[PDB]
Amino acid sequence: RGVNKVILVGNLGQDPEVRYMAVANITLATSESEQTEWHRVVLFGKLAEVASEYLRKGSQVYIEGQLRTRKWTDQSGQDRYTTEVVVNVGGTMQML
Amino acid sequence: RGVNKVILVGNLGQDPEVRYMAVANITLATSESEQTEWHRVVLFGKLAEVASEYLRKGSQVYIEGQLRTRKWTDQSGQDRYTTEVVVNVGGTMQML
Amino acid sequence: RGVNKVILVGNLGQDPEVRYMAVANITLATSESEQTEWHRVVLFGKLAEVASEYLRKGSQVYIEGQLRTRKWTDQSGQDRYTTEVVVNVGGTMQML
Amino acid sequence: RGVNKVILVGNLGQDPEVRYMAVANITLATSESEQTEWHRVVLFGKLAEVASEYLRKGSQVYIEGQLRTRKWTDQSGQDRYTTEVVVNVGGTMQML
């Protein structure tokens, strides 16, 4: 079964892209120092409502989730893959 | 500065692709249940020597590292990106 | 080897969505009578330049191509598929 | 009125799924070389009886029909669409 766990603590790059099917899309940024990196976090369930409700750009946050990489072939007929951090169950989100 | 941390516990899909510059390349697989997923782990430094030395396909392992996504444009002149889990400093590898 | 051939004669629904990588995207409409249907035509190669150059919404056209259905999993983690008519080699496009 | 025509020559993937309301369901496969593709052919009317009668898996066939894409919303309340090749009138089926 193994374990797939990702922990990230960083600030948003832009206000949440919540879209009620709900599902929020956020791009967390986690530096060093700075090879500042960016992260594509997908907050499923209710946890999304909250993001919209009071998260909002600049906001520092804590996230626990799992790694999800989905492959999606494009027009030119080529296979491309996107890697993201999903917050379904288990994971969590926490304003700081 | 934020935090970028990834924890994974799974089994290899194929023996290590170590290449002394060293650097080992391993594809960890971490299921659920099973949407079994696969992971592209890059073990830098000395930690690579060990992988080659005694890791080897099927081997169950523990890994702590950071998320690295590098973009690389191709012949057709298009921008593609690859997401991996690097084991430089901080991270670790542990036979189980 | 079999044969996969599609012939369509209809009018565009909206001016071409050419995007130089080139590749044009057009939605041909082919009625009866009227269960008017719509088609997602993808004009690869040079044939795209022309589309942009002088095709343009309302324009009646002739197209010969092949059937291409690509599957692409989404955020909710579900597999979805899109069916289109590609104009690579063989196929053709012809202003009428 | 436009024209919507599809011509395919390939072999079945599995014996016909005829269901007398009749209507047969067949998944034709048409390669290149091989990006082997598969097709969802729906043989309406009498043409279905024949399919059941003597078509049967592996059988190479010729088909002329029209493109039909129907949209059907699912439990999660999302809109999904399925694209198929219908053999009502006009089209034809021919053992080879």
UniProtKB/Swiss-Prot annotation, chains A, B, C, D:
Entry's Gene Ontology cellular component terms: nucleoid
Residues annotated as domain SSB: 3-94
Keywords (A to Z) from UniProt: DNA damage, DNA recombination, DNA repair, DNA replication, DNA-binding
GO molecular function, one term: single-stranded DNA binding
GO biological process, one term: DNA recombination
Location of the DNA-binding region in this protein: 38-44
Keyword DNA repair: yes
Record text on subunit structure and interactions: Homotetramer.
Functional summary from the UniProt entry: Plays an important role in DNA replication, recombination and repair. Binds to ssDNA and to an array of partner proteins to recruit them to their sites of action during DNA metabolism.
Name by which UniProt lists this protein: Single-stranded DNA-binding protein
Source organism of the structure: Escherichia coli O157:H7
